[PDB]
Design an enzyme around this catalytic site. Structure first.
Site, PDB file in Angstrom:
ATOM      1  N   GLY A  68     -42.404  25.443  -7.475  1.00  0.00           N
ATOM      2  CA  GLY A  68     -41.065  25.419  -8.075  1.00  0.00           C
ATOM      3  C   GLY A  68     -40.907  24.482  -9.256  1.00  0.00           C
ATOM      4  O   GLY A  68     -41.825  23.739  -9.596  1.00  0.00           O
ATOM      5  N   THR A  69     -39.716  24.505  -9.858  1.00  0.00           N
ATOM      6  CA  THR A  69     -39.409  23.679 -11.032  1.00  0.00           C
ATOM      7  C   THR A  69     -39.265  22.217 -10.631  1.00  0.00           C
ATOM      8  O   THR A  69     -39.092  21.903  -9.458  1.00  0.00           O
ATOM      9  CB  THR A  69     -38.113  24.116 -11.761  1.00  0.00           C
ATOM     10  N   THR A  70     -39.332  21.331 -11.617  1.00  0.00           N
ATOM     11  CA  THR A  70     -39.278  19.893 -11.363  1.00  0.00           C
ATOM     12  C   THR A  70     -37.836  19.446 -11.103  1.00  0.00           C
ATOM     13  O   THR A  70     -36.913  19.869 -11.799  1.00  0.00           O
ATOM     14  CB  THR A  70     -39.869  19.085 -12.541  1.00  0.00           C
ATOM     15  N   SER A  76     -36.453  21.638  -5.088  1.00  0.00           N
ATOM     16  CA  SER A  76     -37.455  22.431  -5.774  1.00  0.00           C
ATOM     17  C   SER A  76     -38.085  23.345  -4.751  1.00  0.00           C
ATOM     18  O   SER A  76     -38.312  22.925  -3.619  1.00  0.00           O
ATOM     19  CB  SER A  76     -38.518  21.516  -6.360  1.00  0.00           C
TER      20      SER A  76
END
Ligand SMILES: [Cl-]
Lengths: 243, 244, 231, 240, 235, 241, 111, 250, 195
Positions: free
Chosen positions: A29-31, A74
């Site tokens: 996932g994204t930060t 995330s």
């Protein structure tokens, strides 16, 4: 072998492989990050702009629990929402019975016990999110990070997702260079910088910065989104530091 | 989920057999032989105990022959613990029938009920069947003396003489050879013990190995008496028939 | 492979294969397009027929006077989810005398889809939805995927060959967003967008399905000779 | 509760648990049903592997559901009791609410519906039983003979057989039964039923059971000696 | 083993796809919708000559304005018919009117996907639901175990379906009379049936606004078969 | 080989899931020790804060179950907190129902019986934790009772848990072989804590700063954990003799 | 004891013409001898060219109208925007009212 | 968060074996030796207190448990399974008997109730059998003294004397030679200590041996006076000192 | 329902049951048979609250008929009465009890004896030589005390029953519209059509 096919099965190591596989969804996932400051906390997240067709500022990721706790995560976004929905029910029942708003360590264990419960049976899947959350209570500021296993600890700085190593390195500098502490307005600027620096791991697509904060002085101990001029000031500060 | 570990106890094989019933019958084939023989003036139940030890307290022991009511008894072959679950159910069904109709339960009705319970475990619930085969010896005023058997499938049938448990093929051939319709209890006692004496896997048939019972309409003034034989009484009937 | 038998099982790389297979059912479904301006929001759907004797499967479902969706994938799952939306829209009206916000509608669909992905026995929903609506903050368009992910957009498309319509909208973004107070021109842009996802077949009178909602426009569906104007 | 889907579809569109239930019926003793002009006869095989039996008290193969309808079966005996019990209860429940005994078609449809329900309910297997349900509707003199099977399909038959070697006796009936002129009397119908069983049974009269059902609740089971007379007459005519 | 509600890698429910295979094994059923009525016809397919073919009930009344034909595991259809009839009568009770043919079909189809680990498996039967209402006139629907239904001008289901559907493709036009449709069903049934078509192994029915849903007598169908033979011999 | 996935018997008569839960116990790589004084029961445990981003004040494997009962856990923290919350609930419910404070050994038994159930019932997994309960019981005096994933439990004169438990155990065994008594003959708890730390230093062969240890002390009518500065005072006293 | 019912007064009147219908009601709302409102609408447009009023206990009246309006909404959803005929509406309202046969809606209804 | 194990985990294998029961019996075999001997005026049950550590206080772990005032139990196999069975056995003695009849159950019926619980773990959904064999010694007014063995299957047998677990085969042969129907309780205790010495490796004393008797009524252990009919518990656990005294005359 | 009488003679049981069904002000029917055949040799007459009487009778009938099919055997009158009593004894502690009083007249084919049981709505069973429910017994028991003998013929039982009916017609306020009489003996149940 076959120990990784079912949740709640100990491998010969003593490991629950399904939980470790959930961690991989988190790492994908994204930060997202969290920074504990003098009288509060700051949350920030990387939102990948998949397309020009995404409406700016609309797909909000950071979620409020009660009025004083911020949650960011995330990994599998729906799993995060499910966890925050539960958190809201926990915070509500706590306030209903005990009157005072739920303390952050109390709230942390409520999420912790719920996530841990999803590692006890083969009939459920573990959570595919690491959740960074916190806020201001009667004892001051608290920042937490909660893993798919149900493991959580208190943090000075926290980071998770694809850019976590980059972020963690930056957070570790702030802890060393500011032992007396960081101000809330400073933490917003630094949060913007750290998301921008951590974006080198997701560098293909451009992104949208989103920041929120609880601070005793700056927001009266309530969770608020950083908007308008203060957001643009943090974006400018971040853009200046990468160049 | 849990599906992974489900044996599926209530399914058909490709041949149209119930796996667990067949395997339960295989279990029962190793259990100590029990014989029932029905005469004109009574029924005999004879059965062979499985665990010969000199230290087993025999006079207070009961693994084979159980009393369901005053008119009906059973001989067990298979798991004793499984049988006791079913026995206590059958004891209750008999008393429920007595409470409702103020008459002792007819033998076939009791047998059908137990057999229906066993059937249920083969068709639904996902549980293993009871690893038990019963010989029911009983009396009622409709059919008089009756012998039945039930097995883990829940099928039951009536008999003049029958064996369950070990060596039933051999036992049923010997009974079929020496049984006659005009036979009496004393003759049936002798037939039951002679059949066990030949089919037994042991070196010799002794009193400490047997459980023995009779249902006679040879009580005082035309009533029916269930006699569960004491160890000394089994020893006496072994000497009388000429086996020891 | 070994980790696709049920929804409750993560793969070793952190993937939910049953959810991804449900996502695949959407790609097999017929194309549908969504787009909006500041005043109106439009759904355009290419309906699919079984053969020449059959009718064309309906793609657009009304949820309230100010909200509705188009579907792509399993139509029975779109019925279940649209019925759920109808009820939530209705609950908001009866209890709070309040039209349900489109953003909040998305959040409800997300959470409903999610429960099916984390529990044993259930399956994910096998359908993608494009929700349009006009609420107190103007026009909206949402894209629902049965993973749970809901996304607010200016325009999008889902289904087979949807990447053609999605690229067109990505170029046209600055034009169609400005089509305010002109429903026919906004529908034209949607019909021109869905045309980029066509191969072999073209837009006929009983093939095309259009819907619109806006400022002084209830959610209304146009089928048959009502869409001949736009062909 | 145990919820497991035991009856499910396989890639070729078959429900194996239903088809394996039919294999249990194939194993079961042969049963036959033949309807005459003013009667129905139910013939049943009794396997002679079991001697030393008590024929007074052993469960008889033909069961009365009401005073005017009977049910015979092939397959698992224990399973058949459950269908018979439910059918008997429904027969009394029909009399209680409709003030009229069940039609043979209605009772068949009920038993068939119970069999069907077990093919798509969780935690249960299908009944390893096919039935022949025969009788006369109330105030009616037209004979009725129906057949059911584990899947839950049911249908009406001029004559029919089920169970082991039912293929052979169905072959016999298909050439010997004339629809334009069925067995006019009870004698003719019983004779044709015994004859058809004699193709498979391969033993005298102890292995054959016959039950004659006539209009207006007139049901009677034939004895060994009555059946043995039919067996004697058939083979004496055959020696020619 | 594997979940009953499991998706395949192509995005289809295994059980639904396998139930469709069971329907292919079933006897043929054909429906043709016209402006004068909807005709429903079926192959009876008796497994033996001793089976009394009039007891084969593969065409069924739901209400006076709605008929139904079936193909596949026909025992599974009884609870679907029961639900349809109850839905039809219940709607008349609540609203003092006939129920729309689409609304009836939709009600039946809502049962279809109620299976899991509710019933243990999908239905193994497809339905042709034919009817008339005042809003949308004469209608024919194909109700599957997937929970989907399509309206059709004409439709064949069962073992001869793809062969029959290609034939219905050519033959159907919007100006068909009822008499023409009857013959057309008989023609296409005779084509795809194994055994030779007659009044005892095939059944006709129709639904008109005036007379409602009627299963045809064997004597009536016999005349239409004789009329068909003559008109095919005529050229 | 599904006899290794759920809690059923293998052919050898073993429960592999129980045995694998025991291995999860050492996943933290932390060693704990518990000893008894005259008036007190002391429990010490290693504290490892590897990440600088962690708030070290929140990193703990010692729990205050009730006023009188403390519990140190050897195992992963989610299971440790699962066990902690349940023990707290049980201790509170006990007081409400029976009108006196739950004894240490009774809580241990109760938690052990719960652990037993997970070894018999298939749907519940064992918790991968060893629970060491400590108190100064009003009837029995200083008390150490330990529970494991098998559902076993027993009282202890002293105990040790973790990867290097055997080294700590033998060190303690040898001390009690000399003294010939079941406890540390010492008046103040401060000196019993100093003994505990000293004998862990000797057994593990490592020196400790204030932030490397975590200490719990049970006295009559309260259990409490020591702060970093309270431990520092303890470490200074050890070094000065 | 708590009395769940009240009387909000008012009066309503339906008259059917040849190609029209009227449903009239006074706008006064009362309890006991107090006027609550001089203009509280009692007769409502329910859609599909149907007008309704449930006069008596105003809380039960509002509840019923609200439920019928919703019934019209769901009749559109479930039956392809079909117009609910007045005879059908009436039968639907019978079932709404009879649903609370043993705890009645305390109102005289006219559509 | 569901118990989906509604199906049996113990099933019949093709050979007719119930695997899980056999494996439970294997677990019992690995367990420490325990024995029971019945005298004319009493019963004795005994086992080795196998201490898992010398720091552990083996007094706190009671392998020999009072079920009723006149019934005691000992086991071989898995201790936690035994402990929960003792909890259930004590409770069922009250619920299914004492609260109905106002008296404690006889040995055989309490045994029957324990047997029933163990059988249910052999057939119910989602459970394994208990991994213990019990030896239950007791007294009641109409049956006198009695000794029963209970296995993982739920089956139970009355014994004059027996042993279970590790060295049971050797111990049962030893008891066959020594047992007679004229034994006094002291003679049975003496034989119990001799039999148990063979299976024990290490220390052999009152601290490493657990031994209890069902004997005469103990009015001194009752706790109260003033009811002539209540004469005190027949169950008595021998002290560490009482065992050592008899080990000198060994 | 008003008057139900029973009298057990030498070789039969005779049940007499009134024909009137009155609701409030009007007599709705004057030919009502207040009885059900439970089995070929067991007849149950009944009286009590409207609805409850028939519902209970037909419910018992269905259960006894179900038993008869299952076992291919007729339950003894004693057994049927004990079943009925239990059903009523269960009923009395229900949410809404059956307010029904019954007489069960049967011929036991095993013992070759007529048997009459009187059971009230509480489940109070008694075997009697003669019985009645409600106000009937107040007039008729004193007659039967005087005139009854155990060895009476069926014709003597019917004459004794006429004397009971005449007394009830003379002294009771309600017009019960005569009685339907039924005889239960070894040959089964038959109705005396002229009384
Ligand atoms: Cl407990």
């Amino acid at each position: 072998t076959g120990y990784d096919l079912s949740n709640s099965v100990f491998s010969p190591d003593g490991r629950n492989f399904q939980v470790e596989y959930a961690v991989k969804a988190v790492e994908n996932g994204t930060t997202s990050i969290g920074i504990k400051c003098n009288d509060g906390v700051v949350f920030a997240v990387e939102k990948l702009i998949t397309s020009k067709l995404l409406v700016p500022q609309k797909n909000v990721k950071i979620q409020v629990v009660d009025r004083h706790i911020g949650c960011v995560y995330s990994g599998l976004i729906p799993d995060g929402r499910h966890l925050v929905n539960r958190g809201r029910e926990e915070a509500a029942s706590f306030k209903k019975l005990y009157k005072t708003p739920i303390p952050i360590p109390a709230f942390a264990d409520r999420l912790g016990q719920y996530v841990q419960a999803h590692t006890l049976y083969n009939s459920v899947r573990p959570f595919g999110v690491s959740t960074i959350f916190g806020g201001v209570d009667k004892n001051g500021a608290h920042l937490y990070m909660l893993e798919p296993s149900g493991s959580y600890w208190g943090y000075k700085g926290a980071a998770t997702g694809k850019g976590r190593q980059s972020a963690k390195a930056e957070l570790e500098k702030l802890v060393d260079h500011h032992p007396e502490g960081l101000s809330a307005r400073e933490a917003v600027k630094q949060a913007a910088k750290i998301i921008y620096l951590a974006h080198e791991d997701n560098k293909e697509k451009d992104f949208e910065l989103e920041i929120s904060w609880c601070s005793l002085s700056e927001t009266n101990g309530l969770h608020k989104f950083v908007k308008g001029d203060l957001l643009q000031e943090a974006i400018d500060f971040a853009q200046k530091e990468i160049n | 989920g849990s599906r992974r570990y489900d044996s599926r106890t209530t399914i058909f094989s490709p041949e149209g057999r119930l796996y667990q019933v067949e395997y339960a019958l295989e279990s029962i084939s190793h259990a100590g032989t029990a014989i029932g023989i029905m005469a004109s003036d009574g029924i005999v139940l004879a059965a062979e105990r499985k665990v010969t030890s000199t230290l087993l307290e025999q006079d207070t022991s009961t693994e084979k022959l159980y009393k369901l009511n005053d008119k009906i008894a059973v001989a067990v072959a298979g798991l004793t613990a499984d049988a006791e679950i079913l026995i206590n159910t059958a004891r209750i069904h008999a008393q429920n029938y007595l409470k409702t109709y103020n008459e002792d339960i007819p033998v076939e009705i009791l047998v059908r009920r137990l057999s229906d319970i066993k059937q249920g475990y083969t068709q639904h619930g996902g549980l293993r069947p009871f690893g038990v085969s019963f010989i029911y010896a009983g009396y009622d005023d409709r059919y008089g003396y009756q012998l039945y058997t039930s097995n883990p499938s829940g099928n039951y049938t009536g008999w003049k003489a029958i064996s369950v448990g070990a060596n039933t093929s051999a036992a049923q051939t010997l009974l079929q050879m020496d049984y006659k319709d005009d036979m009496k209890v004393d003759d049936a006692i002798e037939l039951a013990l002679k059949t066990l004496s030949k089919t037994t896997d042991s070196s010799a048939l002794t009193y400490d190995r047997l459980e023995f019972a009779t249902i006679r309409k040879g009580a005082n003034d035309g009533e029916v008496y269930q006699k569960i034989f004491k160890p000394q009484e089994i020893k006496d009937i072994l000497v009388k028939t000429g086996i020891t | 492979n070994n980790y696709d038998g049920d929804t409750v099982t993560f793969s070793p790389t952190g993937r939910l294969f049953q959810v991804e297979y449900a996502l695949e059912a959407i790609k097999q479904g017929s194309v549908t397009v969504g787009l909006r301006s500041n005043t109106h929001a439009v759904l355009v759907a290419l309906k699919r027929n079984a053969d020449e004797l059959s009718s064309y499967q309906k793609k657009i479902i009304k949820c309230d006077e100010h909200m509705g969706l188009s579907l792509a994938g399993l139509a029975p799952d779109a019925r279940v989810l649209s019925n759920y939306l109808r009820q939530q829209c209705n609950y908001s009206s009866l209890v709070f005398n309040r039209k349900l916000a489109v953003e909040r509608a998305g959040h409800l669909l997300c959470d409903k889809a999610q429960k099916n992905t984390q529990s044993y026995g259930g399956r994910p929903y096998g359908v993608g939805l494009l929700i349009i609506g006009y609420d107190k903050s103007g026009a909206h368009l949402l894209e629902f995927q049965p993973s749970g992910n809901v996304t607010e957009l200016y325009g999008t498309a889902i289904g087979a060959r949807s990447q053609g319509a999605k690229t067109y909208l990505e170029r046209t973004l600055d034009t169609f967003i400005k089509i305010d107070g002109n429903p026919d021109e906004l529908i034209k842009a949607g019909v021109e967008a869905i045309s980029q996802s066509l191969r072999d077949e073209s837009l006929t009178v009983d093939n095309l399905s259009i819907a619109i909602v806006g400022k002084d426009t209830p959610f209304t569906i146009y089928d048959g000779e009502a869409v001949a104007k736009y062909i | 509760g145990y919820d497991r889907a035991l009856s499910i579809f396989s890639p070729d569109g078959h429900i194996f648990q239903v088809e394996y239930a039919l294999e249990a019926v194939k194993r079961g003793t042969c049963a036959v049903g033949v309807k005459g002009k003013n009667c129905v006869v139910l013939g049943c095989e009794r396997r002679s592997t079991l001697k030393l039996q008590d024929t007074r008290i052993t469960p008889s193969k033909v069961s009365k559901i009401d005073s005017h309808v009977v049910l015979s079966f092939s397959g698992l005996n224990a399973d058949s009791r459950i269908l018979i019990e439910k059918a008997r209860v429904e027969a009394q429940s029909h009399r209680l609410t409709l003030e009229d005994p069940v039609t043979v078609e209605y009772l068949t449809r009920y038993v068939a519906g119970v069999q069907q329900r077990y093919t798509q309910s969780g935690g249960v297997r299908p009944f390893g039983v096919s039935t022949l349900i025969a009788g006369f509707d109330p105030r009616d003199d037209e004979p009725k003979l129906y057949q059911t099977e584990p899947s839950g399909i049911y249908s009406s038959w001029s004559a029919q057989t089920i169970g082991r070697n039912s293929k052979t006796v169905r072959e016999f009936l298909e050439k010997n039964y004339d629809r334009k002129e069925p067995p006019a009397t009870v004698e003719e119908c019983v004779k044709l039923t015994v004859r058809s069983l004699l193709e498979v049974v391969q033993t005298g009269a102890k292995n054959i059971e016959i039950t004659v059902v006539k209009p207006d609740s007139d049901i009677v089971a034939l004895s060994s000696e009555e059946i043995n007379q039919y067996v004697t007459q058939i083979e004496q005519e055959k020696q020619e | 083993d594997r979940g009953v509600s499991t998706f395949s890698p192509e995005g289809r429910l295994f059980q639904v796809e396998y139930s469709l295979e069971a329907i292919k094994l079933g006897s043929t059923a054909i429906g043709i919708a016209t402006k004068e009525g909807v005709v429903l016809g079926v192959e009876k397919r008796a497994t033996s000559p001793l089976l009394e073919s009039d007891s084969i009930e593969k065409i069924v009344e739901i209400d006076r304005h709605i008929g139904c034909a079936m193909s596949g595991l026909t025992a599974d259809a009884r609870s679907m018919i029961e639900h349809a009839r109850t839905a039809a009568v219940t709607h008349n009770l609540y609203y003092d009117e006939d129920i729309n043919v689409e609304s009836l079909t939709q009600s039946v189809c809502d049962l279809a996907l109620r299976f899991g680990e509710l019933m243990s498996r999908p239905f193994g039967v497809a339905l042709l639901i034919a009817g008339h209402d005042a809003d949308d006139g004469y209608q024919l629907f194909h109700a599957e175990p997937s929970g989907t239904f399509y309206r059709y001008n004409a439709k064949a289901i069962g073992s001869g379906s793809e062969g029959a559907q290609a034939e219905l493709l050519n033959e159907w036009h919007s100006s068909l009379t009822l008499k023409e449709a009857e013959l057309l069903v008989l023609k296409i049934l005779k084509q795809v049936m194994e055994e030779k078509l007659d009044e005892n192994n095939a059944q006709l029915s129709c639904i008109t606004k005036q007379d409602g849903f009627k299963i045809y007598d064997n004597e009536k169908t016999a005349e239409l078969i004789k009329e068909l033979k003559e008109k095919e011999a005529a050229e | 080989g599904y006899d290794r996935h759920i809690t059923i018997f293998s052919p050898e008569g073993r429960l592999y899931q129980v045995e694998y839960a025991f291995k999860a116990t050492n996943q933290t790589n932390i060693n704990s020790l518990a000893v008894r004084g005259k008036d007190c029961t002391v429990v010490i445990s290693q504290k490892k804060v590897p990440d600088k981003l962690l708030d070290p004040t929140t990193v703990s494997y010692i729990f205050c179950i009730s006023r009188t009962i403390g519990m140190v856990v050897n195992g992963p923290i989610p299971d440790a907190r699962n066990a902690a919350l349940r023990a707290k609930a049980e201790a509170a419910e006990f007081r409400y129902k029976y009108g006196y404070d739950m004894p240490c050994d009774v809580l241990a038994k109760r938690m052990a019986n719960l652990s037993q159930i997970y070894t018999q019932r298939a749907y519940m997994r064992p918790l991968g934790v060893i629970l060491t309960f400590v108190s100064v019981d009003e009837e029995l005096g200083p008390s150490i009772y330990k529970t494991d994933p098998a559902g076993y439990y027993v009282g202890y004169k002293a105990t040790a848990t973790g990867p290097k438990q055997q080294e700590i155990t033998t060190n303690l065994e040898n001390h009690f072989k000399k003294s010939k008594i079941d406890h540390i003959n010492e008046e103040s708890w401060e000196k019993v804590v100093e003994f505990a730390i000293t004998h862990m230093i000797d057994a593990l062969g490592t020196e400790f700063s204030k932030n490397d240890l975590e200490v719990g002390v049970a006295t009559k009518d309260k259990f409490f954990t020591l702060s970093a500065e309270n431990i520092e005072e303890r470490l200074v006293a050890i070094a000065e003799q | 004891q708590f009395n769940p019912y009240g009387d909000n007064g008012g009066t309503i009147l339906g008259i059917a013409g040849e190609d029209f219908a009227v449903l009239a009601g006074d706008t006064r709302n009362i309890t006991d001898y107090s006027i609550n409102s001089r203009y509280e609408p009692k007769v409502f447009d329910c859609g599909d060219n149907i007008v309704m009023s449930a006069n008596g206990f105003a809380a039960d009246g509002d509840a019923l109208v609200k439920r019928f309006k919703n019934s019209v909404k769901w009749y559109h959803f479930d039956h392809n925007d079909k117009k609910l005929s007045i005879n059908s509406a009436a039968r639907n309202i019978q079932h709404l009212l009879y649903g609370k046969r043993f705890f009645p809606y305390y109102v005289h209804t006219i559509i | 968060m569901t118990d989906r194990y509604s199906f049996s985990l113990t099933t019949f294998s093709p050979s007719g074996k119930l695997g899980q029961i056999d494996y439970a019996l294997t677990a019992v075999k690995q367990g420490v030796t325990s024995l029971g001997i019945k005298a004319t005026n009493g019963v004795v049950i005994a086992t080795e207190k196998k201490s898992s550590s010398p720091l552990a206080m083996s007094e706190t772990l009671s392998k020999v448990s009072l079920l009723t005032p006149d019934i005691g139990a000992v086991y071989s196999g898995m201790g936690p399974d035994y402990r929960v069975l003792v909890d259930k056995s004590r409770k069922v003695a009250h619920t299914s008997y004492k609260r109905i009849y106002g008296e404690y159950p006889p040995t055989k019926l309490l045994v029957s109730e324990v047997a029933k619980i163990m059988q249910e773990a052999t057939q119910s959904g989602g459970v394994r059998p208990f991994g213990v064999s019990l030896l239950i010694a007791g007294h009641d007014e109409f049956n006198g003294f009695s000794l029963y063995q209970v296995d993982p299957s739920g089956s139970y047998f009355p014994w004059k004397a027996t042993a279970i677990g590790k060295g049971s085969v050797a111990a049962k042969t030893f008891l066959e030679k020594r047992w007679n129907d004229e034994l006094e309780l002291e003679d049975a205790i003496h034989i119990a200590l001799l039999t148990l010495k063979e299976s024990v490796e290490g220390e052999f004393n009152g601290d490493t041996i657990e031994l209890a008797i069902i004997g005469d009524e103990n009015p001194d252990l009752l706790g109260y006076t003033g009811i002539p009919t209540d004469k005190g518990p027949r169950f008595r656990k021998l002290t560490s000192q009482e065992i050592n005294d008899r080990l000198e005359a060994l | 329902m008003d008057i139900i009488l029973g009298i057990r003679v030498q070789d039969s049981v005779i049940l007499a049951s009134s024909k009137a069904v009155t609701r409030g002000i009007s007599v709705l029917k004057d030919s009502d048979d207040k009885t059900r055949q439970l089995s070929p040799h067991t007849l149950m007459s009944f009286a009590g609250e409207a609805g409850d009487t028939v519902q209970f009778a037909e419910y018992i009938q269905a259960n006894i008929q179900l038993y008869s099919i299952r076992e291919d055997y007729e339950l003894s009158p004693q057994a049927v009465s004990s079943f009925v009593r239990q059903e009523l004894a269960k009923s009395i502690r229900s949410r809404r009890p059956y307010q029904v009083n019954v007489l069960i007249g049967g011929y036991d084919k095993k013992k070759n004896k007529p048997e009459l049981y009187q059971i009230d709505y509480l489940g109070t069973k008694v075997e009697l030589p003669y019985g009645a429910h409600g106000y009937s017994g107040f007039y008729t028991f004193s007659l039967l005390d005087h005139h009854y003998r155990p060895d009476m013929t069926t014709e003597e039982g019917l004459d004794l029953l006429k004397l009971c009916v005449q007394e009830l017609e003379k002294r009771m306020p309600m017009d019960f519209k005569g009685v339907i009489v039924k005889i239960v003996d070894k040959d089964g149940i038959r109705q005396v059509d002229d009384f």
